[PDB]
Amino acid sequence: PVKESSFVEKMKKTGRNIIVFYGSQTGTAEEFANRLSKDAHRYGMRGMSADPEEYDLADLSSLPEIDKSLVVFAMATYGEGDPTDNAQDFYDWLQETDVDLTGVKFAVFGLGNKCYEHFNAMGKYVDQRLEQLGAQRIFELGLGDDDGNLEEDFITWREQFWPAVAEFFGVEATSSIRQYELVVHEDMDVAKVYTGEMGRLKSYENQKPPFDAKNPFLAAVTANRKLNQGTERHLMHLELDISDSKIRYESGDHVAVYPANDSALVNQIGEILGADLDVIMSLNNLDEESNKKHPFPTPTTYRTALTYYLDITNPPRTNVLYELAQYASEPSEQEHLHKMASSSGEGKELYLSWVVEARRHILAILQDYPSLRPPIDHLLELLPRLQARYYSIASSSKVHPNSVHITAVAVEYEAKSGRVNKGVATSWLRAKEPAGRALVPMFVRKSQFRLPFKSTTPVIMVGPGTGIAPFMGFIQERAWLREQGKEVGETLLYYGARRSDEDYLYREELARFHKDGALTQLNVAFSREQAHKVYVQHLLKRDREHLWKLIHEGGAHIYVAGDARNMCKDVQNTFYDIVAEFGPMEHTQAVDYVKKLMTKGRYSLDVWS
Template identity: 85%
Template sequence: MGCAYSAHQDEPIPRTSSVKDRSFVEKMKKTGRNIIVFYGSQTGTAEEFANRLSKDAHRYGMRGMAADPEEYDLADLGSLPEIEKALAVFCMATYGEGDPTDNAQDFYDWLQETDVDLSGVKYAVFALGNKTYEHFNAMGKYVDKRLEQLGAQRIFDLGLGDDDGNLEEDFITWREQFWPAVCEHFGVEATGEESSIRQYELVVHADMDGAKVYTGEMGRLKSYENQKPPFDAKNPFLAVVTTNRKLNQGTERHLMHLELDISDSKIRYESGDHVAVYPANDSALVNQLGEILGADLDVIMSLNNLDEESNKKHPFPCPTSYRTALTYYLDITNPPRTNELYLRWVLEARRHILAILQDCPSLRPPIDHLCELLPRLQARYYSIASSSKVHPNSVHICAVAVEYETQTGRVNKGVATSWLRAKEPAGENGGRALVPMFVRKSQFRLPFKATTPVVMVGPGTGVAPFIGFIQERAWLRQQGKEVGETLLYYGCRRSDEDYLYREELAGFHKDGTLTQLNVAFSREQPQKVYVQHLLKKDKEHLWKLIHEGGAHIYNTFYDIVAEQGAMEHAQAVDYVKKLMTKGRYSLDVWS
């Protein structure tokens, strides 16, 4: 079954929930739970860890539940001690520049504002992050510290998971020490009972009405046929692809520019925001997976949670077909997270699940088991390469098609970029390509005052958000507004290969919107030239803009600040951090 698409609009979706429904303490009392594991998750990993921990509780004579903080009133934490041997665990991922994940934003805001007394509340935190970012595990660290400040008692040390290393190993190591600490604190012992391997049971629907079967929708059944705002991660908008053109001339890589029509969607965005798209897996890979497992992919089934009290009734929208699940809901191309024993064979060789099954002929799990264990296929985020002032009815994307050969000789392709590449614009060959999407707000913003200088630094597709910034500054000039200096430092390989938006940038430079257009080509001449070389060349002017002109900076300037400000490196880092605090230094990143 494929995804059914339509552009019909209707009234907004009402979103209400009773106070009682939002009380997790009441639910724990009703269902006999004493451990709750909250997760702040952007890609599904923190949610998976939370589910594992809640399931572990059974081994110690306790009962756990995993919970999305977005679905509950966290002020209820103060009532948690009413439950005997109660424990709150937090698996918190950090997103972007030290931000909470979307589903943990309200929890974060509440922690900042509340002065509730959490005396008697027992807690533990496992943080998920990446040490290559400056704000490593900022969200997990904040939750751990703030709960203690409010009077809660930490019963085990903060766990720090590093996705730049081996996040799975970090979690396993923490988890193996966490449960003995729980046993010691509450005076309980392992029961010796193993919880069921299965979290979901398979139900096959022989004569299911097609109108009741999910065909790729993320939330509401038939939401793609009857579109209702507001549009978000659980209710994406089906945008028509109106433009899909190759940006570069070279054949080695495929860099593309897409335009998505958001007319009549009521979606609003600002320059610097991110657009999220829900991709689909390659149908050829899905068919190969079905063939190797000997499964009928068109069987309609449901995977129902064995825990009837759980809020999460299914691992993905059900009922649906195996084909739909493997195409729209499950990640079949990323290597499974695993321990050190399989690091080289699985991770370094980039074997996804199909490759593992192909290379292990004796391994043939039932397809429903596989569907339960595979992670969810996540939305992919891209910096919006347009300004809503200029393009209010469309969102522009700049992306590079990912394709590489693995150690095994297989060619792996990026799920989303390969899928986007194949989207033919509306009207071409009778097509009407649709992309499920929503907009995620960002802190990556132009300065409020148009006269403030702006310095932008970006290599490759990193230029995408700056296209929106420059478009907006050009629009402001057209409105008769005075606009400050606008400088772009842009890194490419060769002028005839990957100089993206060349004509557009040249036009902005010619009309004066871009005060400076500085492009570094790393492979065009014998001596490689990178963006940092151009930055150092302009160091005096840049320092003046930063130190005296209050320029907003959109990348790193440590070396220039240190040299021109006569500072040690550590002082330069502190200086840039102060710029960050004032909102004058921005990075466009996400985890």
């Protein structure tokens, strides 16, 4: 991953004095970082956001060479509280370097979901580490939260941070400064225009290994079917064919897919703006001396950008709102949009409840504020990149070597906005028909969710709802280990659904596995076949005695998947009580015991929200 030259020098030659780095894997930290970088303007200073992977942080010690220099970090934490992929490099350096950062002014804003254990472990580490190296914190450590409203935590922090910096450096506060320039292309050859590929032009038709995030492999959907018997929701099973892709994976890994936005939605946005979505165009950084020449693959059409490259369904951030206000001919509306940036008062309230709460996407806002009619080109520059969506492979590669399986629930809910929101990836995937050739752009991502190495070790799997997913690959694999002739320890599944005739995923397959003996136990909690709720943990508590046996002496591995919100957190506490009672020990020591399994690789997680 060839590094760019000294970022300090890039600042010198560009007149910059502040730089923001992002530890972003889904784009959050990256937009904050850009927003932050943009702000520099308001105070006679100039900034720049940058991926830390592309640079060499050892150069922080050269940062003092620039007057009123400052460096911000917007790191995001990942599973078990580790650096984001792009920050891994920087993380190790901080863990080895002893370079003197005397003179370095810095501030850290951490993006971490509070209901996470290592709530912002990364951001804390960087805040604390740059200090030990001799740098001086210029503003308190920010600890944004994804479970509440990171967007507000970011604004609270943002409004306080800048004054501090201006106060400190002693500068006063200073106009829509567009970042790109529109260039319409008219006769341009069709063979050189992007039509949805993520990387090199034509890479989707001319598929060529290796296949990663930047050059995904379009696998053909060979099976797409309804898994739940009932009709309240739509739970599906898909099978992607990775034949001839040289792609490798193991049960417990994730598969990432790049989706396409709803054609109807994209059509309405262009319609309500009175724009021709078929105009081929390009957007080039107005800042000739910038690394990001284009906000997304160009030349391309507006239709193609809204469909494959942009996020047109999540609630717009306050910064986007504020920038749009100037385009609302009706005063009271312009004022509303402006006041969405507000840190307090009814401004911050209107935003939290009318935008975030109601789940109003870009189109909804355009419709609910009829005087708002921004020019398409500027709007595209403000919207964020469409992110890939991850899924837990529901197959064992030892069994389905040329197939990757997906277990997903289609997202479709009622927003308070009054309309029906559709999940981007799940709607798209649900629509893919084996077409007797439906292609899904994708790539695999290694994880640390792994069955034991000694096939004889006991395996306790807890995965209600769509959390079964990884476990199907696990079971197929332990079912196969027996067939081979190997000795397989106990395999216990703890699963849950609402009703056995509603959404009992893989009811047949799991019955077979149980009959054969691949499943030592198949405990299923139907939370809705009776007045009171019965969940997987209730079953874990029931079987406390036996489970402690498999744990304290059997050396069993525990795996929890599915809801990260509360199903786990209850399942985690249920393990605490098991341990506390069958040890025995006091609660506090049960918690240590369990926590020690998590670090010894005997307690794993694959949970999402």
